[PDB]
Amino acid sequence: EVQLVESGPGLVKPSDILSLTCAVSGYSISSNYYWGWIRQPPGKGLEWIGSIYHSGSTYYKPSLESRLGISVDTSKNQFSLKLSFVSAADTAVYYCARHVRSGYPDTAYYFDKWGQGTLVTVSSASTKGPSVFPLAPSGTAALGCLVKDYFPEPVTVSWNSGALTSGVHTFPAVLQSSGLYSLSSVVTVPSSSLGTQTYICNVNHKPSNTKVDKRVEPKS
Amino acid sequence: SYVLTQPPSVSVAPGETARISCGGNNIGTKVLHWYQQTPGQAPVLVVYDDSDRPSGIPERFSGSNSGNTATLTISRVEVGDEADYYCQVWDISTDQAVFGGGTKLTVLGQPKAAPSVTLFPPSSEELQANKATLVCLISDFYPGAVTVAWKADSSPVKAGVETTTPSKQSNNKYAASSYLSLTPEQWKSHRSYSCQVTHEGSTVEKTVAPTE
Amino acid sequence: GVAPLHLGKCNIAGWILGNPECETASSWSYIVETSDNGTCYPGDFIDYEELREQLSSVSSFERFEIFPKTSSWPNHDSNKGVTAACPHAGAKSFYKNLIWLVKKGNSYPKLSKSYINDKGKEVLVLWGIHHPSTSADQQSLYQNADAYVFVGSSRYSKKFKPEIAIRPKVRDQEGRMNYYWTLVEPGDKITFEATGNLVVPRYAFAMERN
Numbered sequence: 267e268v269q270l271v272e273s274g275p276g277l278v279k280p281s282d283i284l285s286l287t288c289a290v291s292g293y294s295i296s297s298n299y300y301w302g303w304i305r306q307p308p309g310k311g312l313e314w315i316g317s318i319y320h321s322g323s324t325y326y327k328p329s330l331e332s333r334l335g336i337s338v339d340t341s342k343n344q345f346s347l348k349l350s351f352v353s354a355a356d357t358a359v360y361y362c363a364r365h366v367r368s369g370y371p372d373t374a375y376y377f378d379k380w381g382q383g384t385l386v387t388v389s390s391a392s393t394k395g396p397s398v399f400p401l402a403p404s405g406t407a408a409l410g411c412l413v414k415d416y417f418p419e420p421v422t423v424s425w426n427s428g429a430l431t432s433g434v435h436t437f438p439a440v441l442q443s444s445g446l447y448s449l450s451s452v453v454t455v456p457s458s459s460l461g462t463q464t465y466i467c468n469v470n471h472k473p474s475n476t477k478v479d480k481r482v483e484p485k486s
Numbered sequence: 487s488y489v490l491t492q493p494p495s496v497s498v499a500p501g502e503t504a505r506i507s508c509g510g511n512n513i514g515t516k517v518l519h520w521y522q523q524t525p526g527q528a529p530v531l532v533v534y535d536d537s538d539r540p541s542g543i544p545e546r547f548s549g550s551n552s553g554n555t556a557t558l559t560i561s562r563v564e565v566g567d568e569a570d571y572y573c574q575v576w577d578i579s580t581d582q583a584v585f586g587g588g589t590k591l592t593v594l595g596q597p598k599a600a601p602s603v604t605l606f607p608p609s610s611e612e613l614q615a616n617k618a619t620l621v622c623l624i625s626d627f628y629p630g631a632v633t634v635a636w637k638a639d640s641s642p643v644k645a646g647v648e649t650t651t652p653s654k655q656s657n658n659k660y661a662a663s664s665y666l667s668l669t670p671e672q673w674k675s676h677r678s679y680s681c682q683v684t685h686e687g688s689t690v691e692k693t694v695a696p697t698e
Numbered sequence: 699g700v701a702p703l704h705l706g707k708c709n710i711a712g713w714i715l716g717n718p719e720c721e722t723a724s725s726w727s728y729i730v731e732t733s734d735n736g737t738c739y740p741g742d743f744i745d746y747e748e749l750r751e752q753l754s755s756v757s758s759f760e761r762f763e764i765f766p767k768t769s770s771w772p773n774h775d776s777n778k779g780v781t782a783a784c785p786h787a788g789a790k791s792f793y794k795n796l797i798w799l800v801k802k803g804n805s806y807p808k809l810s811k812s813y814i815n816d817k818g819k820e821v822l823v824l825w826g827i828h829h830p831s832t833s834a835d836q837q838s839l840y841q842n843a844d845a846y847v848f849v850g851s852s853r854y855s856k857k858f859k860p861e862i863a864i865r866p867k868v869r870d871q872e873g874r875m876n877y878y879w880t881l882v883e884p885g886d887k888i889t890f891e892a893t894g895n896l897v898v899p900r901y902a903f904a905m906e907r908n
Contacts, residue, residue, distance in 0.1 A: 304583075304585075311570075311572065311585060311586075311587045311588045312521070312529065312572055312574075312585045312588070313585065314574075314582060314583035314584065314585060317583075325581050325582060325583075326582075327487075327582050328487060328580055328582060329487065361528060361529075366534070368517050368534070368535050368576070369535055370517050370535060372517070372578055373576065373578050374516070374517045374535075374575070374576040374578070375576055375583060376519035376531065376534045376535075376574065376576075377519075377521075377529075377531065377574075377583075378531050378534070378540065380528040380529060380530075381528065382527075382528050383528055397615075399608075399609040399611050399612045399619075400609050400611065401606040401609065401621060402606075402609065408604050410606070412606075412609070412612075412619065412621055414619065435623075435625065435661070437623060437650075437661055437662075437663045438650055438653050438661065438662075438663070439650075440648050440649070440650045440663060440665060442648050443648075448619075448648075448665060449663075450606075450621055450623060450663060452604060452623060485609075485610055485697060
């Protein structure tokens with residue numbers, strides 16, 4: 267019922283500032299909770315970063331304290347993270363989470379509600395948006411979209427603007443020797459409904475501002 | 487900073503009991519919380535305040551902090567329980583939350599499942615741009631390893647191939663993909679191309695050919 | 699005329715509150731003391747001095763459970779009241795002779811528990827008042843922001859109220875606990891009333907001064 271959603275750039279150059287916001291819905295921050303951040307580099311463990319109370323009191327990880335700021339905006343029901351002077355060591359999926367006070371006497375907090383997370387890559391490499399090609403069908407037929415040659419991760423795919431979810435399988439990306447990624451998303455549909463219906467693959471790659479929607483029909 | 491130590495791995499047969507320990511100096515003096523993370527998802531709180539369960543969490547999950555390693559205990563393990571499990575405390579002397587390094591739970595005994603293979607030829611749009619990619623999608627297989635071989639007609643091509651490692655699909659099976667980059671002339675000059683996926687000694691093959 | 703009471707590495711406060719580090723007799727002529735393991739949870743011991751003089755020489759001394767832990771507190775959590783400030787063998791603990799009451803579920807209903815002196819001698823009763831660091835701590839522990847505590851007898855009467863503030867960290871604690879004590883006459887009733895912040899007596903001591 268309480269939901270949290272992270273946003274901000276997915277690509278940051280070294281020495282710049284990583285900025286994120288968490289929008290909370292369904293619950294007012296101005297309430298008896300702390301609100302904070304935990305990150306996870308790809309394939310590694312969770313690392314707690316810091317937290318804030320609506321009054322402004324903060325807790326920061328000691329090793330990061332010199333580079334960290336956290337703020338809260340109760341009027342928009344959100345809070346934000348700023349991590350300064352970043353390097354590749356700061357590449358991670360960043361989660362925001364509600365911090366619950368332990369019922370025990372001594373100060374202790376645990377994290378009961380979490381956002382889905384957002385990836386931030388810290389790199390000197392330029393962004394590249396993907397080229398998107400349809401993967402034509404042919405009872406039933408599997409059809410899809412090829413999302414080719416982008417950087418960095420991630421790319422989201424939806425079908426028919428989210429009207430179509432069942433049977434959708436968006437595959438983990440391949441990282442090519444070029445340093446670029448590619449992925450594919452496939453869905454299986456009644457063959458009979460290509461004459462009368464419409465399947466579109468929506469691809470968004472935020473670091474390059476790449477909104478692309480592609481109709482998958484069958485070749486002539 | 488305070489250090490929490492977990493074993494990297496625990497394996498268990500279905501229906502048996504898994505125990506995951508979390509060591510720290512005088513850990514009995516701190517309260518412990520535990521998180522579950524399934525491939526592809528945010529962590530989920532399974533135990534807080536050493537031994538309490540959030541609403542909705544199966545009674546199979548319990549925690550302890552007696553003796554001097556704390557423990558997450560999972561009774562009657564189900565395949566759906568495969569995940570990374572993290573312990574966490576709050577260090578009052580330095581005002582920060584600390585996580586352990588995580589433990590991967592594997593459930594043994596799972597039956598072999600052959601891969602489903604879908605192979606797509608290059609799109610017209612891509613051919614129009616003087617490029618060509620064959621796309622081999624491999625899903626729903628267990629255990630998590632395959633090898634992929636490609637053929638041009640009946641000959642073996644190795645140049646231009648990129649294949650992912652397999653990763654867990656949250657239904658606990660695995661997925662992988664393989665891409666073959668060709669010139670449009672190579673695509674058109676052969677009768678067919680095939681993607682052959684070998685899994686546990688068995689090969690699943692799909693073939694595509696230029697349309698005209 | 700009696701051997702002294704040796705408190706080893708403890709002082710009187712830690713011994714009598716039951717600091718877990720502090721582990722007997724029914725009589726002694728004086729107390730030998732050292733001043734480190736006293737009140738493991740930081741705060742003030744009210745009229746500590748009179749308690750020392752009062753305990754210096756005694757002829758009868760029995761510890762008894764004035765309020766049984768498993769029977770006295772149906773509407774409250776009598777299990778969570780432990781801390782790292784008061785450790786007992788690598789685990790978080792608390793004074794053996796007190797119970798730190800804490801809300802059950804998400805409500806702290808009014809507490810009203812009484813005891814009548816049916817010992818044939820003066821009974822020494824101790825207790826504490828907990829003072830949380832933030833108003834957020836006050837709610838997580840006690841639910842009620844207008845928490846009050848009353849303790850009464852024929853000779854003792856006092857209402858307590860929590861003072862919420864950030865103290866400097868002592869044994870990693872920003873909150874404080876104050877300790878009180880009174881003597882209950884042989885025919886006397888002592889009543890406790892609380893909407894939070896009350897550290898409850900568990901053991902008390904039947905005695906005779908010399």
